[PDB]
């Protein structure tokens, strides 16, 4: 199933108080009106890729979803983040957990911390080893799909775990449909009111109107013509053309000669009509110093 | 626990200790004469008692004497690309001392491993625990070592007779990250009483300036620490003692 991500998933990108101002910031936000995947909890908890940041949304009435598991293999071979909420305690670990064949909750350890009607929206991202988790709870009266409207996301948790996570799975309480979207490096124009709260945001890479909006850093565009960007056709393939060189150049012999000349009569051999690889020069560890001054060594092939 | 540790980890599994919820002095490290190299360009070591950082990580590892020059931004070498890569915009101060009387044995200390073979340069602050056998030749390597199949980890023979270029050196990289989050690792400077309705040279969590500190009605959310205006100047600050 698929759903349109109307306006949800906009968050405070940093923690500097701003008020009554339109500020542009480029960060990992989910695109407006993009396709988000829809999961059900009737009669379904697969693993999804944690590529660059995930936005999660859940509609809840009886507290079914109680935790999440993030990692790469999820088989006690590596450290995997497990967050669980038992009704009084929130527990976050990255321990060498022994996961079940199908992880659920019924009715080398490095870290441990212990403390429809309700829409709970979250965003999970990993920046420089820091796991940022933002969340917000709101009352809703809607059973079919996710509601239409705007809601700014406030940050809650920042954990310095320093773990590479690429896949994640949720934890459900078994005796509740949810939505998952992906973040992208987009530039958003955020509006701070007089209370300092973000009341609106424009994904200005959505359409020409939003492009004009963020080029003019305003939510209102007057009548007229405005230059917004520059289009340029991108190349589709690379075309390398070099002479049909037929002779590898005797670079080995100037290193493997019987005797070398002295410094007072150093020999100057011109190298011409040659194919120069220099890879055997890089990989060989017999050299004491390898110092290139004009051109970088790796950019010679 | 990080400077006078019993044993240091090798560069293939270098320890990354997060230092938080304490007072960082660095005064005993400046007066210590047993240290060999103490180099850093981003931040000066003398202006740390008044300045405060958000967080700091200690990257400790044992490396050879002649390889201590490779742990620096802009350097190129075997260790700088296969075991410990430092970014070009790295801020922080690195310390290194000799361990010729600790990590040495009669027959040789072979408990320190370093990566020698890798098909790609390491990322900044990347920890490569990959044990897969490197494939040097054109034939595929199915985990069996031999021709064109080498183990990327190698060891040195540490003896008290070896030269200063082959002696083991304990290197600790103190990398400071400064974010807008509330700081926790500040210098050893005592605080004083606060005065209002008069402009004074203030210094809150390393952020210094001059001006009047007046009461505010701006509702700062939990982890708000500093306020920035259109001119990127400080507009409001949160006292670390009183919320």
């Amino acid at each position: 199933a698929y759903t349109n991500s109307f306006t949800r998933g906009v968050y405070y990108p940093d923690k500097v108080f701003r008020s009554s101002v339109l500020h542009s910031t480029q960060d990992l936000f989910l695109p407006f009106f993009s396709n988000v995947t829809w999961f059900h909890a009737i009669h379904d908890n697969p693993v999804l890729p944690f590529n660059d940041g995930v936005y999660f949304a859940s509609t809840e009435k009886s507290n079914i979803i109680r935790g999440w598991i993030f990692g790469t293999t999820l088989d006690s071979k590596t450290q995997s983040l497990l967050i669980v909420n038992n009704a009084t305690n929130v527990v976050i670990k990255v321990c060498e957990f022994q996961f079940c064949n199908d992880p659920f909750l019924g009715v080398n350890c490095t870290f441990e911390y212990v403390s429809f009607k309700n829409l709970r929206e979250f965003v999970f991202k990993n920046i420089d080893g820091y796991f940022k988790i933002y969340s917000k709870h709101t009352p809703i009266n809607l059973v079919r799909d996710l509601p239409q409207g705007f809601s700014a996301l406030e940050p809650l948790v920042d954990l310095p775990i320093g773990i590479n996570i690429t896949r994640f799975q949720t934890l459900l309480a078994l005796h509740a449909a949810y939505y998952v979207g992906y973040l992208q490096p987009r530039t958003f124009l955020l509006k701070y009111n007089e209370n300092g709260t973000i009341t609106d945001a424009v994904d200005c890479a959505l359409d020409p109107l939003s492009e004009t909006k963020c080029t003019l850093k305003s939510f209102t565009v007057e009548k007229g013509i405005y230059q917004t960007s520059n289009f340029r056709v991108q190349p589709t393939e690379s075309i390398v053309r070099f002479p049909n060189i037929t002779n590898l150049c005797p670079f080995g012999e100037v290193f493997n000669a019987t005797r070398f000349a002295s410094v007072y009569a150093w020999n100057r051999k011109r190298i011409s009509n040659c194919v120069a690889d220099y890879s055997v020069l890089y990989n060989s560890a017999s050299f004491s110093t390898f110092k290139c001054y004009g051109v970088s060594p790796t950019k010679l092939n | 626990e990080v400077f006078n540790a019993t044993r240091f980890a090798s560069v293939y599994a270098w320890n990354r200790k997060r230092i938080s919820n304490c007072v960082a002095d660095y005064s005993v490290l400046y007066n210590s004469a047993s240290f060999s190299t103490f180099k850093c360009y981003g931040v000066s070591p003398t202006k740390l008692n008044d300045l405060c950082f958000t967080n700091v990580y200690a990257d400790s590892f044992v490396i050879r004497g002649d390889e201590v020059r490779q742990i620096a931004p802009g350097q190129t070498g075997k260790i700088a690309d296969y075991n410990y890569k430092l970014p070009d915009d790295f801020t922080g101060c690195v310390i290194a001392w000799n361990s010729n009387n600790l990590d040495s044995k009669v027959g040789g200390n072979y408990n320190y491993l370093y990566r020698l073979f890798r098909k790609s340069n390491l990322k900044p602050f990347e920890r490569d625990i990959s044990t897969e056998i490197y494939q040097a030749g054109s034939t595929p390597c199915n985990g069996v070592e031999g021709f064109n199949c080498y183990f990327p980890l190698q060891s040195y023979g540490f003896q008290p007779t070896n030269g200063v270029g082959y002696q083991p050196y304990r290197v600790v990289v103190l990398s400071f990250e400064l974010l807008h989050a509330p700081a926790t690792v500040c210098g050893p400077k005592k605080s004083t009483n606060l005065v209002k309705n008069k402009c004074v040279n203030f210094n809150f969590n390393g952020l210094t300036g001059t001006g009047v500190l007046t009461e505010s009605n701006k509702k700062f959310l939990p982890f708000q620490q500093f306020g920035r205006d259109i001119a990127d100047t400080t507009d409001a600050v949160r006292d670390p003692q009183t919320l």
Partner: antibody
Amino acid sequence: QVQLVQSGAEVKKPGASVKVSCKASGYTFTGYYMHWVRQAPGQGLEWMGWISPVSGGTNYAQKFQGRVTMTRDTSISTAYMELSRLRSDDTAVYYCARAPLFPTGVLAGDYYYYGMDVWGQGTTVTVS
Amino acid sequence: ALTQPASVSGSPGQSITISCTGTSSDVGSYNLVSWYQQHPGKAPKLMIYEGSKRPSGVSNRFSGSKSGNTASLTISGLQAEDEADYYCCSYAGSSTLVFGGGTKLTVL
């Protein structure tokens, strides 16, 4: 100044096991894969296996796969080779051997090249 | 796995050759053939390695040659001390240091 010493002569019964030590000095111990060769009295040489003192890598001959076991102690720079399920034709002289170059031969076809340093003697005799 | 003559005789001062024939997959595709000398009851000594390269200290009288699928040891100026067994060596595809029938060199 490369010095190599092995254990003494040993006698074993058929079906038992034998453990020989191989203690080296004067060079970087882990920088040389240790090869092993056996020779029956009055016969030719017979290579048996090699061990990597670094990371503990080892590989045996398909002739002896399952009967011979190696370990090594880098703290004292020694190798140890064990022959299990001994029979009559294992009465022979055994050496370890040091490979020629360093394991930095991008080409240095190591450690499959050869043996420059051969050890003194270990004679294992297996008779009822 | 390799074949070499069992015993060949020579005279003092003579230049003598010792053959060792392999296949195209072990000696014919690799320039990695060698020659070892061992005296009776003695430890073997590597005389020729990596085709014709010699370890330090070995006399120049021992040289090597390779032709198609054949290795050849050459000894210039045969002496009485040259009496020993000579083995050819070549990589064969798997573990490991292999040999020949053994060439016992005798002087007349």
